Specification:
10% strand, Thiol:disulfide interchange protein DsbA, disulfide bond, protein-disulfide reductase activity, 5-stranded mixed beta sheet, 5 strands, alpha+beta, Glutaredoxin
């Protein structure tokens, strides 16, 4: 059962005001099948959380390019419009698989070919919701001294530690990972 150092580690400087459950990810990290494993785990942690506990997921630029920046703004657009589950795979496929995403217009087209209206994308993109969310994603990663993706944090205090878990089959991993998030959203 649960101890500091094993299933989770404790941030030396806790973050006040952090989301209750904060996951970080990048579109530029991992083989497509690896990216999709991470999505499965994230969706299963969501599923097994206690009613009322929300999961927040933030994007990370990784190499500092303008493509990375526009994708982080495009992620804030997905959060703003509640279309995360419609665009996550298309987006990474756009970057990773079909490699179609090269400019911000190409990102916008992923949203469109996924049934988001061009006029809707533009409004969110330019919105204050999205400016605030872009700032929040940048700030939160600096606040936890982020050392890589994927990563999950609970209450700005505890970081999930997949090392201290049985990663020798996904279903056991997922249950352990998910049970630990509950112990921490209670702690």
């Amino acid at each position: 059962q649960y101890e500091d150092g094993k299933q989770y580690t404790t941030l030396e400087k806790p973050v006040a005001g952090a989301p209750q459950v904060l996951e970080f990810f990048s579109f530029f990290c991992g083989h497509a099948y690896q990216f999709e494993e991470v999505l499965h785990i994230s969706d299963n942690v969501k599923k097994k959380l206690p009613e009322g506990v929300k999961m927040t997921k933030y994007h990370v630029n990784f190499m500092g390019g303008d493509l990375g920046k526009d994708l982080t703004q495009a992620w804030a657009v997905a959060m703003a419009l509640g279309v995360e589950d419609k665009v996550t795979v298309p987006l990474f496929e756009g970057v990773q698989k079909t490699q179609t995403i090269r400019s911000a217009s190409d990102i916008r087209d992923v949203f469109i070919n996924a049934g988001i209206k061009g006029e809707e994308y533009d409004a969110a993109w330019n919105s204050f919701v999205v400016k605030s969310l872009v700032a929040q994603q940048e700030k939160a990663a600096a606040d936890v001294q982020l050392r890589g993706v994927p990563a999950m944090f609970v209450n700005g205090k505890y970081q999930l530690n997949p090392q201290g878990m049985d990663t020798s089959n996904m279903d056991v991993f997922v249950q352990q990972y998910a049970d630990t998030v509950k112990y921490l959203s209670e702690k």
